[PDB]
């Protein structure tokens, strides 16, 4: 089977910049290569067919070239609607295969997260589990490290996080991390801390609380 390798994994560019995306095939596919665009919760949308031909409705800012094993999609100047995931697909041989996607993300000025820590509620504790939550609000770029500390002990494997889609108004991200421990474990310790490492922060920021105090 023909393996399509896409690069870069993530393009960060500002509206107006030129986007250049690559698709490399494990053997020649001739000119039988399509590009698709996908926004979250939506079906993929055909942009380019047979390597260089615009599908109907597709604006002139989209173009492609390449044949054989090397292909490039170009968006000459990025519009707000162009930030999404782009897939290549080969139609040369069976099975039909796709690249693993390139995400085109909006670059803006770096912004440091505002960090907020939340103790578990008394109601939650009543039933035997503790969720300590940490919020990192309105930051760019996406990459951030949350490090949980319980009495200075670096915590690992007992947290989960998720990240909002890039904001349509100011192009930032927000991230929520939850530390989960048993009620019994929560009650052994004093200091619960969320340490945030981010490019927007000169040095890591820590927010904490002491269990049961105001």
């Amino acid at each position: 089977e023909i393996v399509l390798t896409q690069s870069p994994a993530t393009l960060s560019l500002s509206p107006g910049e030129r986007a250049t995306l690559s698709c490399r095939a494990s053997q020649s596919v001739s000119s039988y290569l399509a590009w698709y665009q996908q926004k979250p919760g939506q079906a993929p949308r055909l942009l380019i067919y047979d390597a260089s031909n615009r599908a109907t409705g597709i604006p002139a800012r989209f173009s492609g070239s390449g044949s054989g094993t090397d292909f490039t999609l170009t968006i000459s100047s990025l519009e707000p609607e162009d930030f999404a995931v782009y897939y290549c697909q080969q139609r040369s041989n069976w099975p039909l295969t796709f690249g693993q996607g390139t995400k085109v993300e909006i670059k803006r000025t770096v912004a440091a997260p505002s960090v907020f820590i939340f103790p578990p509620s008394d109601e939650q504790l009543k039933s035997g589990t503790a969720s300590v939550v940490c919020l990192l609000n309105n930051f760019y770029p996406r990459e951030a490290k949350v490090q949980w500390k319980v009495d200075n002990a670096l915590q690992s494997g007992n947290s989960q996080e998720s990240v909002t889609e890039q904001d349509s108004k100011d192009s930032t991200y927000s991230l929520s991390s939850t530390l989960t421990l048993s009620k019994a474990d929560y009650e052994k310790h004093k200091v619960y801390a969320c340490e945030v490492t981010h490019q927007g922060l000169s040095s890591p920021v820590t927010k904490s609380f002491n269990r049961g105090e105001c």
Binding site: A43, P44, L96, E123, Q160, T164, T178
Partner: protein
């Protein structure tokens, strides 16, 4: 107008059977190949196979050969993708698409969730605040997706982030919704999160305010 319409989302248990559908209109269904595509959560596209509804000529991608059955009922312009025994790993969004040789038209997708977990409504806990404050709601231990969360019955939309849910090891989802507000407002303005988890018919309104001592 040419369109592919896929059947609704599905929530299933390992070992159950499932047949999802794709109906074509605005064209002669027997003249175009229909393919099925699998997209697993947070991942890329995979071609599953293809069928010509005119004669039910079917070809499977090698990875899917013998994992699923692709079929078509031409008398009603419908193609199908079925499993006789589902696994948790079958959890994915599934697209159908009209394949023209001489992939212009795609279905809207059918989300398929396969889990051993069972329907359960969330408990909603406060994320209490301590000139910008943050406060919110922790919507914990529910299945399946989705929950909806609004703040003050829709009157508060600015500065609200409702996070994508995380799937816990227990098989239940957990989600947080937060908002940032002026600190001076904390004693005067009311903040209530309105949570609803239709699948379990659990509706909750939680007032959030500074925890006193």
């Amino acid at each position: 107008e040419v369109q592919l319409v896929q059947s609704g989302a599905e929530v299933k248990k390992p070992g159950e059977s499932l047949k999802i559908s794709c109906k074509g209109s605005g064209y002669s269904f027997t003249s175009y190949w229909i393919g099925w595509v699998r997209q697993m959560p947070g991942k890329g596209l995979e071609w599953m196979g293809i069928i010509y509804p005119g004669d039910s000529d079917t070809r499977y991608s090698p990875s899917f050969q013998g994992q699923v059955t692709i079929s078509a009922d031409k008398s009603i312009s419908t193609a199908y993708l079925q499993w006789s025994s589902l696994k948790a790993s079958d959890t994915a969004m599934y697209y159908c698409a009209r394949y023209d040789g001489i992939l212009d038209f795609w279905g809207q997708g059918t989300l398929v969730t396969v889990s051993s977990a069972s329907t359960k409504g969330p408990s909603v806990f406060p994320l209490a605040p301590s000139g910008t404050a943050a406060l919110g709601c922790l919507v914990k231990d529910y299945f399946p997706e989705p929950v909806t969360v609004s703040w003050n019955s829709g009157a508060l939309t600015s500065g609200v982030h409702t996070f994508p849910a995380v799937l816990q090891s227990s098989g239940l989802y957990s989600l947080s919704s937060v908002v940032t507000v002026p600190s001076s407002s904390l004693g005067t303005q009311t903040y209530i999160c309105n949570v609803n988890h239709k699948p379990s018919n659990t509706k909750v309104d939680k007032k959030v305010e500074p925890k006193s001592c």
